[PDB]
Design a protein around this ligand. Structure first.
Ligand SMILES: C[C@H](CCC(=O)NCCC[N+](C)(C)C[C@H](O)CS(=O)(=O)O)[C@H]1CC[C@H]2[C@@H]3[C@H](O)C[C@@H]4C[C@H](O)CC[C@]4(C)[C@H]3C[C@H](O)[C@]12C
Ligand SMILES: C[C@H](CCC(=O)NCCC[N+](C)(C)C[C@H](O)CS(=O)(=O)O)[C@H]1CC[C@H]2[C@@H]3[C@H](O)C[C@@H]4C[C@H](O)CC[C@]4(C)[C@H]3C[C@H](O)[C@]12C
Ligand SMILES: [Mg+2]
Lengths: 552, 1341
DNA sequence: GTCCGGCTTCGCCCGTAAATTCAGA
DNA sequence: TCTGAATTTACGGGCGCAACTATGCCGGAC
RNA sequence: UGGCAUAGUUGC
């Protein structure tokens, strides 16, 4: 293939073939004139080496290198390896009718549709647009249709809307670790340059919106479109294929909104009043007469289908909250009421969706998930749940736990210097006592954090689960766990080097406090471990899963 | 005091500790290394002088003729840096070397030579480093990253038990030379010392000892102590050294002087050793069983036969003892082979090997090095001599010899580049000592074992690599030359030098395309340390040893600013205060602590030197005199932080920032951020795009100004003075008389670089930051480049941010941006794009740039001129023709019948096709520059003529402007001088300004000064005319274009990307996010005052991603803006200067024990007004990286304003107007617009060009390629039942030519059905397998 | 400018075949 | 002096996916 | 008008 200028591409097979013909011709010429045995012997050896290099370069040794001293890619090198035909052009190929773009949120979408930009929609569906233009007589010859499409006339957009109606598009994220990494959605034309991806499916994709890009593919044939619609639609992949748990569980904002909505405090506006139903609860909350989280009595009618598929109503007076009653308007009929009478963390919502799927079916579950997402987003927005610096309250027991642990390490060191213990067991003992101290600090932090708020304006003090933002997000399961909140407020504990070796020196300061120079130097060991395992030890998991796939 | 530049805007500093050492010149490493490579060095140690003196002089193989060296010189660059960037040539200097050739006649070793012929021969060009530390190689600025390789010397490692599957820790000793062959001494499970050269094959170590002409008995005497057995009467009275009795069990009963110290069987204890040492026991009687296992030291001969009875290294037995008894040998020497302290390693090595004589050793080494070839005595001897002992082929450099001596506990640090017998013996003995148990192996990751190559050193190495080849060529030519006919010009060939030098600067793993989209990006790319590159590691080989942070990286390497990816920890970045030792090792500053007082003198310490010291931490409290107030201070003695008393402290950290680099030192509240998030924050600051206007980070760290000034993006005033003239594209500073040199007058001219393309297609533009008549001091910024405000690095914009969920539009990491942000165009960026159309001389004729474009109407060609090139300033969009070129290289010619048929159809298609460079689809903008490069003798067109005429007029105008500006300054100086001693003023204007050589002045030095000024005028005029002539010659001449290209037309578009969803934005604490919606202004949250928040972020990203530093920053930012608000409140309604300065002083005095202490009483009520004008948009605040503002100070600053101390305010919903409960955190945070724009990522393809070997879609978006349906995607589809989707995915959509063509036709026809077919890549695989001796076929059904 | 040709070592792990070393007769 | 089993040593294969930008692409006789 | 190499970068 010509390179820039008169010079041709410096091909590899051509060089090898062309220095096998050289030796062959030289040897033929030598045998024609009956050259001395030594010279023809050396020429035969060189011919053998050249042929060996052509068939598999470097296998014999002394991999012959061309210009730039790069070993030539022989036939064996072309058919084998990760860059060979099998794993580069036959098991996985580049495909037409495919595009790529950054992904955004677009909360308004339903679970079965995705926002596709108008420009990529036009570029992907060009042949379909040509077919529609020919069918409607707006362009007799394909050149005319192509010209109409490239000018982006006002009429080809209508064609694009008409042809996108019921044409699913596969959306795929780069590390397709499991089968839910590629799912079909109905396109909705978007005025922009980024694909709007439903919030619920993100967990399946492992797709956060911090720069991630995803690829769109277009099924062409009727069989492919029906396969996308009936096998790969996001509204069919409610349950993960690895286990029975739902995979479209709301991730972080919806769960926070639901946790805030379904919750109670000992004294809020409109507490103790008896409501005539969930609609009354929503009316009161919107009117500002009652807090979203205030204990009340609500007349709830729940449907139990213990009969032969017949939903039987049951009306009672439940002791609930305004927010719980409001949320009950979203739950479908067949579910019990106790399913929304708790704090509704992330696991609670996952169990709720699972039970809805097992009891009611698929379509009710999809609708329920969409409504859960909408209501959670709305009420998380209403809650105004923010994060400040005064929310990471430091425990008052942290310092004394630290001092006790330091006394323990001092005494263990004193024993070690006396020879009573050897280095390895001293290191193990130090590690264990520091782990115990870290656990104690975390426990004290959570104790001071969860019951932090005591609120009363009607009598004696009554403790309650805190409204603290950090705790409210950790308990709800939205984002983070005990470890990260511990590092924020409590002592952040021991670190591990990239080789899975634990630095016996702990970090005595949290993140709200300093982390002085020395403490921010032990931390970098753990940070280097974390980033190296992401970029160097991921090849082991990929290799293992490739072996598992290729054996089964 | 403040020098009228930082007094414009004083950044409130919260740093508690006092700065001791100013931040060094951040680009010091590159500039210094290159300066010590070209600078003339009389000592000849550095650079080209060293290379010449090491190679030259050259003699023939015999003493016939000699070529020696005199000196070298760097010629003036042929073109300026900007001219080189525009044209595309390297910015290099010619290297002209004065070489003299002498001729030696018959028997004239020292006598006068026949003739000496000396000439200044040209030896290639050497690229030059610009003032900013960068090289222009082919029009692109390139940075040569410094390398961090293993220092030359000797290193002992272990391979700790991973071999032999038994846990035994072997020991290897490697002698790494700077340039030579590797020598390794390795052990094996049998504890036999082996050696290998260049890691070819392992052979016994003693062989090389014999190769050094060592006899076996001498080897044994050298490597072992000697035990003496004396046959006085009987029992072999043995000379015993008591200290040798410890560590074993007494196999016999030991007795002397009738005192059995140790009984039979019992082991020897310490008390016994003490008693024997104090008893003065020298000789003992021994049994016969003891000597039965010893090894005789040296050979013995029998007097009767005169032949051998026992040789060296033989296990003595009863038979051998009896044989040597009667021969007369009474004193018997054996080796003291203790079991656990003096191993028989050399003895076993001597026994195992088949080599006994020196020649056998030499032939063995020759066969190992050259396997199969017939060995020769002279060949083997020469090979071994040239291995480690020739000065030309082996060289332990000065640092190498220093490390070699240090590792062997030698005294001197200077030696010979080659090895020696003593050196190898010492290395082997040290390795054996390590094996025994005394001593320790070296750790490679130690920064005292790793050097720092810089651009100068690598350039010198490559220049020497060229010069050795040149030496070979010259030596070859000297043999076959008639000496008295030729000068030293044909003798020297410059092609090797140029080839090597340009192949290192252009195509090398360390000479990298510069990351130029920020001052920070450039300044941290130049301060980069890469373990990769030639002579270094490889990302696929090194693992989890050089990636980890060593304790020695403290103060010499940033532990957190490293790239994440395949090479993490291999691309370390230099620390802020770190410097390079004389030998190339990284050293860091430390304040000396002689007595308990911390002295203010700085010592730079390297890793090894710093190891044996106790260094107090930077955050150690001190008083006015200087004393560690605390009884015990935290220090670090041997890479182990601990607590030390007040007196042992030998050193203290100079600053708290020295542990990090210039990337992480710009992150406020770094200490509160998880180290990963600090790393990501730095990596993302390196990617921020310069916005339309800089925005002066409200919460900085004090390193912004240093970074901006040190990086060559601003126009720093070379000399102080008064701004005489300032426009959008020029500054003229009249220098003060104090700083003015004598003679030349003498006013600085700074030509600002206007809108120009960067390596990342960003915009480089310098805007003046000074006005007319404004005083300027030395080192003050006059013009600020991209991402800079008043000399402070401003990578992004600070705006109002609220932390709360908002209807899911900030779900995971998405950012919700108001329409006010895009309305203000604050994150609008200018991207300049270069499009080159090349007309070449191809077959079937040349190519043409004519405007007669077929198949397109006149409307599309309206924007072009008569010459077929777009106008400057034309607003072009996607598809528009910029430079329409159509070539006679069209199509074939039609035969009579064919042509008649074509003409019958009624078509006049010609032999001209359409190439017609056009704007890429989806890219708009305005044309800002068109450059036409024409080859020599091509008849440049009308547009090229117009461009050249405009360029010539502009060059004349700028030259004349500079000349008359300088001459106005000169005449002003002359008039100022004339004011005394015969001043003429009334009639001075009567005569013309020129005729001032005839004036009347007295006799003094003033008239001499006037004469000097007049001579300066004359030479200025002459050099003016010559420079104008040179510029005209350079403009009018042709261009050295590529071989076979007629001309090049480069069009510079200037697109303006405002903002849109999908554009990635991030803060300084590793917090990312793609904009999810450009919200309406009325829909955003607003506070009690009705001011909407510019951005809404998600709180859930703060706990999960432990970057608390943002929240603190946000709070502080709010406080900062609060202060500004009050100043604005005091400023928009005019108020007295007294109250304003009072409030400003109260704001600046707010702190715990800050060391800024700015006093406003010395501002004169006029600089206070400018300061207030600068502070009305929020008071800038400096938060040092580890000495930042505590939360209490943030609360105090918040309370100084009318803001709540909690940092959280009450917000109302823009949509419903309803209050948000749970008051939200609102402040001002510094958003960066990273260089990942959605329109650069969006891509789509339905049908396009396919690859050649396999008919699959092309890859990438630069070529209209398709997305890769990877193997894992195939697995995912198999997990579904999607068989038809997969089949069409990998057959009809990828590589079935008939299948895909038919499917396209069916889609156009309205039928969605496919014919499967067979992939073409499968046929390719079949043929490739058949290209071997394998017959793979698809057998019939 | 147009036409013609054959000096780098330095990673971790595991499976398998060849060579060695016991452990005998 | 031979011969089988177990052990050691040598040596060949493996070392995730997807995506974007830039430069450079052969050295020696007529 | 499609290939390889090197360097840098993004998402996991
Ligand atoms: C004079 C100077 C020390 C002054 C006291 C000595 C000590 C170490 C020597 C350099 C290092 O070896 C690295 C490198 C080796 C190359 O081979 C030649 C260049 C380099 C820079 C050497 C030149 C010079 O010799 C150095 C700087
Ligand atoms: C202030 C200074 C006086 C110094 C005594 C005077 C004397 C010479 C003047 C400059 C140039 O010569 C002419 C040129 C004219 C163009 O329009 C752009 C302005 C230029 C650069 C002038 C600005 C200024 O007016 C100068 C520096
Ligand atoms: Mg992501």
């Amino acid at each position: 293939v010509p390179l820039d200028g008169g010079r041709f591409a410096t091909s590899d097979l051509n060089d090898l073939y062309r220095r096998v013909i050289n030796r062959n011709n030289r040897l033929k010429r030598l045998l024609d004139l009956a050259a001395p045995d030594i010279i023809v012997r050396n020429e035969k050896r060189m011919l053998q080496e050249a042929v060996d290099a052509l068939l598999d370069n470097g296998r014999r040794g002394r991999a012959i290198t061309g210009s730039n001293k790069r070993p030539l890619k022989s036939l064996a090198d072309m058919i084998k390896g990760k860059q060979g035909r099998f794993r580069q052009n036959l098991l996985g190929k580049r495909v037409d009718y495919s595009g790529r773009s950054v992904i955004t949120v677009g909360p308004y979408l339903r679970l079965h549709q995705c926002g596709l930009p108008k420009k990529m929609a036009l570029e992907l569906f060009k042949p379909f647009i040509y077919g529609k233009l020919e069918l409607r007589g707006l362009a007799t010859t394909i050149k005319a249709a192509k010209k109409m499409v490239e000018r982006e006339e006002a009429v080809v957009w209508d064609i694009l809307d008409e042809v996108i109606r019921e044409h699913p598009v596969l959306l795929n994220r780069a590390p397709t670790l499991h089968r839910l990494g590629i799912q079909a959605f109905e396109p909705v034309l978007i005025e922009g340059k980024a694909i709007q991806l439903h919030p619920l499916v993100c967990a399946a994709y492992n797709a956060d919106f911090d720069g991630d890009q995803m690829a769109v593919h277009v099924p062409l044939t009727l069989e492919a479109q029906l396969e996308a619609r009936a096998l790969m639609m996001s509204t069919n992949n409610i349950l993960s294929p690895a286990n029975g748990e739902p995979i479209i569980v709301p991730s972080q904002d919806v769960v926070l909104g639901l946790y805030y909505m379904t919750r109670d405090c000992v004294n809020a506006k409109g507490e103790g009043m008896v409501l005539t139903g969930p609609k009354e609860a929503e009316r009161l909350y919107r009117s500002g007469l009652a807090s979203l989280h205030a204990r009340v009595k609500v007349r709830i009618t729940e449907y139990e289908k213990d009969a032969n598929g017949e939903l039987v109503a049951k009306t009672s007076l439940k002791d609930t909250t305004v927010g719980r009653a409001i949320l009950w308007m979203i739950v479908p009929k067949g579910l019990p009421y106790s399913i929304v009478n708790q704090a509704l963390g992330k696991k609670a919502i996952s169990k709720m969706l699972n039970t809805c799927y097992r009891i009611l079916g698929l379509k009710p579950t999809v609708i329920f998930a969409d409504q859960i997402m909408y209501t959670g987003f709305a009420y998380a927005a209403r809650s105004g749940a923010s994060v400040g610096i005064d929310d990471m309250v430091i425990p008052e027991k942290k310092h004394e736990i630290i001092s006790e642990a330091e006394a323990e390490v001092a005494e263990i060191q004193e024993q070690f210097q006396s020879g009573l213990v050897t280095a390895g067991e001293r290191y193990n003992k130090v590690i264990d006592i520091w782990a115990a101290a870290n656990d104690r600090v975390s426990k004290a932090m959570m104790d001071n954090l969860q019951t932090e708020t005591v609120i009363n304006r009607d009598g004696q003090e009554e403790k309650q689960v805190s409204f603290n933002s950090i705790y409210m997000m950790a308990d709800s399961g939205a984002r983070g766990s005990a470890a990260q909140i511990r590092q924020l407020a409590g002592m952040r504990g021991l670190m591990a080097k990239p080789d899975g070796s634990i630095i016996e020196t702990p970090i005595t300061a949290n993140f709200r406090e300093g982390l002085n120079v020395l403490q921010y130097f032990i931390s970098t060991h753990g940070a280097r471990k974390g980033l190296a395992d992401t970029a160097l030890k991921t090849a082991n998991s990929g290799y293992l899963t490739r072996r598992l796939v290729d054996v089964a | 005091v403040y020098s009228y530049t930082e007094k414009k805007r004083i950044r409130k500093d919260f740093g508690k500790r006092p700065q001791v050492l100013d931040v060094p010149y951040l680009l010091s490493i590159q500039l210094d290394s290159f300066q010590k490579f070209i600078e003339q060095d009389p000592e000849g140690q550095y650079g080209l002088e060293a290379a010449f003196r090491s190679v030259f002089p050259i003699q023939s193989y015999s003493g016939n003729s000699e070529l020696q060296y005199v000196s070298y010189r760097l010629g003036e660059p042929v073109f300026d840096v900007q001219e080189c960037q525009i044209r595309g040539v390297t910015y290099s200097a010619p290297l002209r070397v004065k070489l003299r050739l002498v001729i030696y006649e018959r028997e004239a070793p020292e006598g006068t030579v026949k003739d000496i012929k000396e000439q200044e021969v040209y030896m290639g060009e050497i690229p030059l480093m610009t003032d900013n530390g960068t090289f222009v190689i082919n029009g692109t600025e390139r940075v040569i990253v410094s390398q961090l390789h293993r220092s030359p010397g000797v290193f002992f490692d272990s391979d700790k038990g991973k071999t032999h599957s038994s846990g035994k820790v072997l020991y290897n000793a490697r002698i790494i030379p700077y340039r030579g062959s590797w020598l390794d001494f390795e052990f094996d499970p049998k504890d036999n010392l082996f050696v290998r050269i260049d890691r070819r094959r392992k052979l016994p170590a003693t062989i090389i000892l014999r190769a050094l002409n060592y006899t076996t008995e001498q080897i044994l005497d050298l490597f072992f102590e000697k035990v003496i057995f004396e046959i006085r009467d009987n029992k072999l009275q043995m000379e015993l050294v008591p200290e040798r009795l410890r560590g074993e069990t007494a196999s016999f009963d030991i007795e002397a002087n009738g005192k059995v110290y140790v009984e039979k069987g019992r082991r020897i204890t310490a008390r016994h050793i003490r008693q024997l040492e104090k008893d003065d026991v020298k000789l003992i009687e021994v049994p016969v069983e003891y000597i039965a296992g010893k090894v005789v030291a040296k050979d013995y001969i029998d007097e009767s036969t005169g032949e051998l009875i026992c040789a060296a290294n033989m296990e003595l037995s009863l038979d051998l003892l009896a044989k040597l008894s009667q021969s007369g040998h009474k004193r018997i020497e054996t080796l003291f082979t203790n079991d656990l302290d003096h191993g028989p390693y050399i003895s076993e090595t001597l026994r195992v090997d088949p080599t006994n004589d020196r020649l056998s050793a030499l032939v063995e080494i020759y066969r190992m090095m050259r396997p199969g070839e017939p060995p020769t005595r002279e060949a083997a001897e020469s090979l071994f001599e040239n291995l480690f002992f020739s000065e030309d082929r082996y060289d332990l450099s000065a640092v190498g010899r220093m490390k070699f001596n240090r590792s062997l506990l030698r005294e001197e640090i200077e030696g010979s580049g080659i090895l020696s017998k003593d050196d190898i013996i010492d290395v082997m003995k040290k390795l054996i000592d390590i094996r025994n148990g005394k001593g320790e192996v070296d750790d490679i990751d130690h920064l005292g074992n790793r050097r720092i190559r810089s651009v100068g050193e690598m350039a010198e190495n490559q220049f020497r690599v060229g010069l050795v080849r040149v030496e070979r060529a010259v030596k070859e030519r000297l043999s076959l030359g008639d000496l008295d006919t030729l000068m030293p010009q044909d003798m020297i060939n410059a092609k090797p030098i140029s080839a090597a030098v340009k192949e290192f600067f252009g195509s090398s793993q360390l000479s990298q395309f510069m990351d130029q989209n920020n001052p920070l990006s450039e300044i941290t790319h130049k301060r980069r340390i890469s373990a990769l590159g030639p002579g270094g590691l490889t990302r696929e080989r090194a693992g989890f040893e050089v990636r980890d942070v060593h304790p020695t990286h403290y103060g010499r390497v940033c532990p957190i600013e490293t790239p994440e990816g395949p090479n993490i920890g291999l691309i370390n970045s230099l620390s802020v205060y770190a410097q390079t030792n004389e030998y190339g090792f990284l050293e860091t500053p430390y304040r000396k602590v002689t007595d308990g007082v911390v002295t203010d003198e700085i010592h730079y310490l390297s890793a090894i030197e710093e190891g044996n010291y106790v260094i107090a931490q930077a955050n150690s409290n001190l008083d006015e005199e200087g004393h560690f107030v605390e009884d015990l201070v935290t220090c670090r003695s041997k890479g182990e932080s601990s607590l030390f008393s007040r007196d042992q402290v030998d050193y203290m950290d100079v600053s708290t920032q020295q542990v990090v680099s210039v990337g992480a030192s710009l992150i406020p509240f770094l200490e509160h951020d998880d180290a990963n998030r600090a790393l990501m924050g730095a990596n993302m600051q390196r990617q921020a795009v310069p916005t339309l206007r800089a925005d002066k980070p409200l919460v900085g760290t004090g390193m912004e100004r240093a970074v901006a000034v040190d990086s060559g993006v601003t126009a720093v005033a070379k000399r102080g003075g008064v701004v005489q003239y300032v426009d959008a594209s020029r500054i003229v500073i009249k220098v003060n008389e104090d700083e003015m040199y004598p003679g030349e007058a003498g006013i600085d001219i700074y030509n600002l670089t206007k809108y120009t393309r960067s390596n990342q297609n960003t915009c480089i533009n310098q805007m003046p930051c000074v006005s007319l008549g404004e005083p300027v001091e030395r080192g003050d910024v006059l013009a600020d480049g991209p991402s800079t405000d008043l000399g402070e690095l401003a990578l992004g914009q600070n705006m109002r941010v609220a932390f709360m969920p908002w209807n899911g539009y900030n779900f995971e990491d998405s950012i919700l941006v108001s329409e006010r942000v895009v309305q203000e165009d604050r994150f609008t960026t200018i991207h300049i794009q270069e499009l080159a159309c090349v007309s070449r001389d191809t077959k079937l004729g040349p190519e043409e740039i004519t405007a007669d474009i077929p198949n397109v109407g006149e409307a599309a060609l309206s924007k072009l001129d008569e010459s077929g090139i777009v106008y400057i300033g034309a607003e072009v969009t996607g598809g528009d023709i910029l430079v329409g070129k159509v070539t006679p290289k069209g199509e074939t010619q039609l035969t009579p019948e064919e042509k008649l048929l074509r003409a019958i159809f009624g078509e006049k298609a010609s032999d001209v096709k359409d190439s017609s460079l056009r704007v890429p689809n989806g890219v708009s903008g305005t044309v800002i520059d068109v450059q036409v490069f024409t080859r020599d003798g091509v008849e440049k067109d009308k547009r090229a003529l117009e461009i050249e005429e405009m360029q010539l007029k502009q060059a004349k105008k700028d030259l004349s402007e500079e000349l008359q500006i300088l001459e106005a300054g000169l005449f002003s100086r002359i008039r100022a001088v004339l004011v005394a001693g015969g001043v003429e003023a009334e009639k001075l204007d009567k005569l013309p300004r020129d005729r001032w050589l005839e004036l009347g002045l007295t006799d003094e030095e003033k008239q001499n000064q006037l004469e000097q000024l007049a001579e300066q005028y004359d030479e200025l005029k002459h050099e003016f005319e010559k420079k104008l002539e040179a510029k005209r010659r350079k403009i009018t001449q042709g261009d050295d274009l590529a071989p076979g290209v007629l001309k090049i037309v480069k069009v510079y578009l200037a697109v303006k990307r405002r903002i849109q969803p999908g554009d990635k934005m991030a803060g300084r604490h590793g917090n990312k996010g793609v904009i999810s919606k450009i919200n309406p202004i009325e829909d955003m949250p607003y506070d009690e005052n009705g001011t909407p928040v510019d951005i809404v972020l998600n709180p859930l990203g703060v706990p999960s991603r432990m970057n608390i530093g943002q929240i603190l920053e946000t709070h502080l930012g709010m406080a900062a803006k609060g202060i500004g608000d009050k100043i604005n409140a005091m400023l928009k309604q005019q108020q007295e200067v007294a109250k304003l300065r009072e409030f400003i002083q109260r704001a600046y005095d707010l702190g715990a024990d800050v060391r800024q202490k700015v006093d406003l009483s010395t501002f004169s009520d006029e600089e206070v007004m400018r300061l207030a004008e600068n502070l009305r948009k929020g008071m800038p605040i400096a938060t040092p990286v580890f000495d930042g503002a505590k939360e209490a100070e943030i609360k105090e600053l918040l309370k100084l304003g009318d803001l709540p101390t909690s940092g959280q305010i009450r917000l109302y919903d823009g949509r419903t107007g309803e209050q948000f409960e749970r008051p939200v955190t609102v402040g001002y945070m510094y958003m960066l617009k990273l260089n990942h724009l959605v329109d650069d990522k969006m891509h789509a393809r339905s049908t396009g060009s396919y690859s050649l070997v396999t008919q699959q879609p092309l890859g990438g978006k630069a070529q209209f390629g398709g997305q890769r349906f990877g193997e894992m995607e195939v697995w995912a589809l198999e997990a579904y039942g999607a068989a038809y989707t997969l089949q069409e995915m990998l057959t009809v959509k990828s590589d079935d030519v008939n299948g895909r063509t038919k499917m396209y036709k069916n889609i156009v026809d309205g039928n969605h059905q496919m014919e499967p077919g067979m992939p073409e890549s499968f046929n390719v695989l079949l043929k490739e397998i058949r290209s071997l001796g394998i017959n793979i076929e698809l057998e019939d059904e």
